[PDB]
Amino acid sequence: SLAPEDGSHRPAAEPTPPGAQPTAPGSLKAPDTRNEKLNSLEDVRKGSENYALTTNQGVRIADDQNSLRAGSRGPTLLEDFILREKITHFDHERIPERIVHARGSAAHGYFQPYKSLSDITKADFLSDPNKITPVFVRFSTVQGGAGSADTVRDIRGFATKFYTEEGIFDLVGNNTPIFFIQDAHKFPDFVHAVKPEPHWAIPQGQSAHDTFWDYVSLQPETLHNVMWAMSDRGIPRSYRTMEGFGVHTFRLINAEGKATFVRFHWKPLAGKASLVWDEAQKLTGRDPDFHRRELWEAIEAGDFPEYELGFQLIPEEDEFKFDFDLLDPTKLIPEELVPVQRVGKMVLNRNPDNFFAENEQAAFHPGHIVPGLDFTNDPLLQGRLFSYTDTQISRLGGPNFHEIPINRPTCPYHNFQRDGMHRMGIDTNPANYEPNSINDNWPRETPPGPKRGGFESYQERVEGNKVRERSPSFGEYYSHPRLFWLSQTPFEQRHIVDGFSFELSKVVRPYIRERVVDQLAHIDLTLAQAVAKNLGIELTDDQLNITPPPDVNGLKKDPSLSLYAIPDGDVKGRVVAILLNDEVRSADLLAILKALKAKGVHAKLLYSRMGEVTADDGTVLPIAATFAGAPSLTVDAVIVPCGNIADIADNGDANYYLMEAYKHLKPIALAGDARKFKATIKIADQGEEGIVEADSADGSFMDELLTLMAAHRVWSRIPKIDKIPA
Amino acid sequence: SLAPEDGSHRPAAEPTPPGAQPTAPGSLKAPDTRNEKLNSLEDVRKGSENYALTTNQGVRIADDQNSLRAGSRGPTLLEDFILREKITHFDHERIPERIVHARGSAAHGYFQPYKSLSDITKADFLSDPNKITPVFVRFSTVQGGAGSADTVRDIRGFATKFYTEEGIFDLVGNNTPIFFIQDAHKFPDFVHAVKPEPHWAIPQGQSAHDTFWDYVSLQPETLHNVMWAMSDRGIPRSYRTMEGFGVHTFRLINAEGKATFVRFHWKPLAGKASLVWDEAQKLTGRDPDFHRRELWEAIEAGDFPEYELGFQLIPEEDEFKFDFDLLDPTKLIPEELVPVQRVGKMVLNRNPDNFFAENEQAAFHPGHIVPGLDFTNDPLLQGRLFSYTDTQISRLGGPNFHEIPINRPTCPYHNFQRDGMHRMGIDTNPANYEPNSINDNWPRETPPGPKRGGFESYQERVEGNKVRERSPSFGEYYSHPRLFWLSQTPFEQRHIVDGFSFELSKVVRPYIRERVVDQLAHIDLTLAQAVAKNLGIELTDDQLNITPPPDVNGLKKDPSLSLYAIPDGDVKGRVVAILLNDEVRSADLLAILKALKAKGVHAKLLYSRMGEVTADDGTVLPIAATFAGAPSLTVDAVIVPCGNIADIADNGDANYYLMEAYKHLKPIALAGDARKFKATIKIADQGEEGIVEADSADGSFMDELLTLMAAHRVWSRIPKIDKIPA
Ligand code: HEM
Ligand code: HEM
């Protein structure tokens, strides 16, 4: 018995804030959170307590510390089958990572529609507001490998497996509403250009290198999604505070056979929020697992990620009514033109038990649709349909990947497919073909119908010759990048210019930087000039005179394209660092902590060492982390209570903690003598917007700080940080 | 879509300093650098210039931009075999990463011995000082995945494949002289404890988490290698500046049949150097590919990594003469007791052409020995001999991994093995068994002998019962960690205390911290008290009274265990940042560059934007990177010439550059009006050792900076950095 007798090895099976208890497998942390998929995995969940250690053949092991040898200092013997099984298993633990989106973090949850959508789709999962569908969701980055960092600048994947009563539907989306390329034939080119360069395999997790920008400079279709990656959309605060999009136009099909075009959206109920670049890049070093950690810990705290599914619907008669083609995945549909209709809510409320078994082996594929949905001829979508089933034959070892437990449907599945590696199901049908008489033709085809019918494709007319040709309707590249640029606030535009400037500075061949800047000049002269200035490039008179692309259907901006132009702040589940001293003013800390708790904001108590400190009134304060152990990168705001401020006033880490938070536009609150830190961040005596300061943490101090938190960052500080040495 | 007319897309095929040209495949960068193995790969090298793009079947492609569809806005057709081949290959590009040491960087080179070693070994590659053996070397970290960061705290792998005339010998070593565990049966337990925890797969690249420290606290045999990992050995500056060790005792066997025990060493001819923790961890975010890039660039510059192979030799009759067991891989052999005899030199002088095909697919295995070498009964080595052939069956797809080009011997190989997946070799032998008459028994066995003989194992006597039992002589765990601790300088001891304090601060369950501090108290009470203080733990009276472990065969210290106690600095291949201004004093820059050039030290010219700046004499200076783009973490020293210092005096990034370099103990040199930066880092008018300052850069100024660089870091500054907010 190695566990401590006090039971402190084991986390409480109740919701607890981040850092209060060790994390645990979801079924041990939240045993009473259930859904139909999580219950169906009970057949394969394996416990451990009170069981004997055995080989995989069920033979009990007596000595798991030693190989069998001839003499205690002698050679190891080949007949040691217990050693060889253990090491064989170990030796073959790894499977290939996903070719793209290899770095991802997943959780279980459930979806429910707000109302029946039977007028527009016969999909069973959207038929009844009382019908709950379990989901499994994986969020990801794109370029880096499974052991790369979370807070890179990249697009994010947002993939949802809906375990419906009429089959698995996978909605395999990203966090921007378009893609970089138009036709799937180019996907290996684009991905090879953004991935580490093939001679030396550098850089990981970064598009900031010559081959990415070479491709971009030569393929202007990429410029719209490059604009989104360069904006703060490319560095989200958390998977909870980003949007999701299916990108492509798909179809909904109703029981009368009417097709409606649809684009899928997820709205984050926590609001939209991103980091700033220097913070994101630094955080990839201080905590490369920051998003995976934040997701897991938000679920263990009960801060469940929630998202609203929404549809942009366009009738079939309106296919050609826009300046852009609905089938072009480099074009977005502005919400000012076509509103998102709210459809239902997804809640992710349980972490997996075993990351490899559930996250690593999960297989999502956008070809997994159900009756009531159909495809369109978007030429990127069309190639995706080939790839996601093909890639599993090597990644997951064969064609029985649907029998891996996480991928199994919860509804019935029966057919005449047999064998393959890893075959789990033992078919008892006398027939393995149809038509057959020997089993009366079962399992049988089902005609299409309003409910529980077979799948039939919408009978779209096709007319044309067999060609390898891009539609001329797709040959417009600059207007949507411009619409995005003009929709951002002034600080978002500054961050876009700084993103392109930093990335192009890492491109070693200067002519590629010049070719990118020339593309920028086809989008917006202000953007191109500001990027060119940071690169020491002067635009030519010809570039200064390029006429801007046309507005999109008359729009010169759409505020739903900005992260921050329309406030949607939510403080619940955010975290504040509290910088302690060795005799904290306990009344300040009571007021601070209870105000945060009331709004669901978490706290981490920091000091210059671990263990405890004692407040003025004798209260014993446990320390969560040190100033360097839990840097300001990992929090949303910083509060310094009064007390013996001389204890930390000359601590370089305490001072730097405030400088780094200040640089990264975070709210900072200073009570009492903690106001002596104003000199460190060069605040004037009469104060400044974004710094909360008072004699004590009472009265309006916490309300002011929480108001700042709801607005996320102090954008007005940007010209001030510009010269702080941090 | 084509190359620039000036040819600047293509790097010069001559040696160039880092940053001067884009990096390139080795065979294009150094076409005249050859060796027998490099030549042998010509059969599979594929060019590209002037060739038509084709399918893998050799059919020319006309349009690689579009899928075949029915009309240009129509559905993609299943008969598009060109799209499907391209996307199938892409979908199957990934293979499983190595179970451990997945992150690694490799290069080609050659080895030769200084003199024949035929008196102690019949190994052909050690028999003649003028017979050169090609090598392929991979350096690696242990824990993280292939996409994790380079400058983590971890043990490093140092694996060398020698392509000898009598077979492939792989010397598969690490950068510390011991391992964490005694018997291979525990390898999966230890690896699972240090790897990301199974519920959530966090943390990547870090031992700073509960399960690792749980395992260490319960298995004190780990403490020796844990001491090495917590020292600055865990964070080398470059793979060129670390030691290598085979860890195990092996045997040499000479032509008369005599066995000598041996342990293998690599000594870095560039000297030993490591980062400091804050620098290392921040660099994982600013350049996660820092070691891979520095190795590739040193080779492109001509700063070839060189290492000296050395042997510790113990005669067979001295097996039991030490106070530790020679077969215990958690024990080192102190060089004060058994000196390292210099054996030969290895030079890495060419980068690979394709990282996947050469680095990712290389397979090293310590059971690949040759006549003149043999194993011992070390119980960790014994189990390794199983694992490295087993694991390639999944990683490399079957038993023909030796036909993957990088793994092929360059000597003859012939036998009766046949088939297996992706069999390349077409055997014409009418026999596939022996003995056979139908091919007159070829290929034939060869008796052992002095040279070109068959392998025979040394006929070691074996006497014991079949037991799973640890030798009692391996049950001592504290004396080697203590010897290591006492052999470090004071600043190295401080960094060890900091490494344990940082790591255990991230262990969430406090009792695990307490248990590790109790282990430390069994090694050295000063170490244990210093770690306990940082953790808010007080040692008990019983803990204060633990008797120190014994000295190791009378030694109180061995300075060969320290990175820094004995000067061994070599500045060739190091890099300095030069902070420019918009009117640099050209006479300062001339003097700086001339002095750096004479010592082989590279420079990177930095500014607040990219492009060029002009010096006072009209010299146009191209800018390598911005201050933020290439932080001080990436260089060894910082020099600031005079000129228009007002241009940069108030720039936050330039001031921070100096504060970060100062904190990280790097030499700084300030000329002329650049001395006004003394105020940012609080240097007294009188100056400080480690800050070079003068009215102009000249011979004396550069000689002083260069002397500082030869000592690597400014250890005397340590007490002055805790107050610095950086
Ligand atoms: C609209 C543009 C696209 C979006 C929104 C998208 C989204 C995603 C996401 C989120 C994943 C990760 C699934 C997971 O978390 O497990 C993924 C995986 C993948 N996608 Fe895509 N993708 C796009 C384009 C493409 C294209 C053009 C192809 C190839 C024809 C492709 C082939 C793949 C493959 C091979 C994987 C790995 C899947 C697996 O191993 O199971 N994707 N995609
Ligand atoms: C002295 C202790 C050990 C040392 C110094 C060591 C060293 C290394 C190194 C340097 C590598 C990376 C080689 C490369 O660059 O590809 C490696 C890989 C590996 N080792 Fe070890 N190792 C040790 C113990 C063990 C043990 C006890 C086992 C299991 C019985 C083991 C099994 C493996 C496996 C399966 C790989 C990956 C091999 C591949 O896929 O090619 N090693 N080891």
**3-class secondary structure per residue, A473-499:** HHCCCCHHHHHHHHHCCHHHHHHHHHH
Give the torsion sign (CA, A318, A323, A327, A330): negative
| Beta-sheet strands, E only, within B54-156 | 68-70, 104-113, 133-140
Q: Which of A252, A150, A154, A243 is nearest to A195 (CA)?
A: A154
Give yes or no for a contact between A657 and A681, defined as CB atoms under 8 angstroms apart: no
Residue A63 has its nearest CB partner, among B91, B468, B650, at B468
DSSP string, A675-690: GGGGTTTT--TT--TT
Which protein residue has the closest C-alpha to ligand 2 atom 2? B179
Point out the ligand nearest to the CA of residue A188. Answer: 1
Write out chain A residues lying below 8 Å of B142, CB-based: none
How was this entry determined?
X-ray
- The CA distance from B722 to B726, in Å, is 9
- What is the Å distance from ligand 1's center to A226 Cα? 18
DSSP code of A444? P
Q: Which of B179, B284, B170 is nearest to B227 (CA)?
A: B179
Helix A510-521 with A210-218: angle, nearest 10 deg = 40
Q: Kindly list the structural domains of chain A, giving each domain's residue range(s) and its CATH number in brackets, ordered by start.
A: 24-409 (2.40.180.10), 469-572 (1.20.1370.20), 573-726 (3.40.50.880)
Q: Measured between CB atoms, does B719 come within 8 Å of chain A?
A: no
Inter-chain residue contact B535 with A611, CB threshold 8 Å: yes
Structure tokens at B567: 């000067």
Inter-chain residue contact A70 with B464, CB threshold 8 Å: yes
Which protein residue has the closest C-alpha to ligand 2 atom 21? B384
CA distances from B374 to B67, B174, B182 (A): 58, 19, 20
- The CA distance from B61 to B82, in Å, is 8
Q: How many beta-carbon pairs under 8 angstroms link A with B?
A: 452
Any atom of ligand 1 within 6 Å of the Cβ of B87: yes
Helix (H) or strand (E) holding A277: helix A277-286
C-alpha dihedral, A36 to A38 to A41 to A46, nearest 10°: -150
Write out chain A residues lying below 8 Å of B610, CB-based: 504-505, 513, 534-536
CA distances from B448 to B411, B451, B456 (A): 18, 8, 6
Structure tokens at B46: 């594929």
Structure tokens at A507: 């491109």
Q: Is B359 a catalytic residue?
A: no
- The CA distance from B343 to B349, in Å, is 20
Query: Which residue of chain A is at minimal alpha-carbon distance from B184?
Result: A67
Which protein residue has the closest C-alpha to ligand 2 atom 34? B388
CA distances from A32 to A133, A349, A375, B576 (A): 18, 11, 39, 59
Which residues lie across from B312 on neighbouring strands? B263, B340
- What is the Å distance from ligand 2's center to B388 Cα? 7
A426: left (phi over 0), alpha (psi -120 to 50) or beta: beta
Give B498 to chain A, closest Cα distance, Å: 11
| Cis check: omega of the bond before B622, within 30 degrees of 0 | no
Residue with tokens 């001491």: B227
Give yes or no for a contact between A280 and A235, defined as CB atoms under 8 angstroms apart: yes
Q: Please give the resolution of this entry in Å, rounded to 1 decimal.
A: 1.5
CA B87 to ligand 1: nearest atom? 30
- The CA distance from B471 to A73, in Å, is 6
3-state secondary structure of B697: coil
CA geometry: angle A556, A560, A563, nearest 5 deg: 115
Residues 6 or more apart whose CB falls under 8 angstroms from that of B102 comprise A94, A147, B140, B144, B145, B146, B148
Give yes or no for a contact between B701 and B694, defined as CB atoms under 8 angstroms apart: yes
DSSP string, A503-542: HHHT-SSHHHHHHHHHHHHTT-HHHHHHHHHHHT----HH
- What is the Å distance from ligand 2's center to A526 Cα? 55
Give yes or no for a contact between A507 and A213, defined as CB atoms under 8 angstroms apart: yes
Helix B490-505 with B510-521: angle, nearest 10 deg = 150
Structure tokens at A500: 């392109």
Direct distance between the N- and C-terminal alpha carbons of chain A, in angstroms, rounded to an integer: 49
Which protein residue has the closest C-alpha to ligand 2 atom 29? B384
C-alpha dihedral, B407 to B409 to B414 to B416, nearest 10°: -20
For A:207-226, CB contacts with B below 8 A are: 210, 218
Q: Is A655 a catalytic residue?
A: no
**Helix/strand number for chain A, H first, E second:** 19, 20
Residue with tokens 């001067």: B20
- The CA distance from A280 to A150, in Å, is 9
Which residues lie across from B113 on neighbouring strands? B344
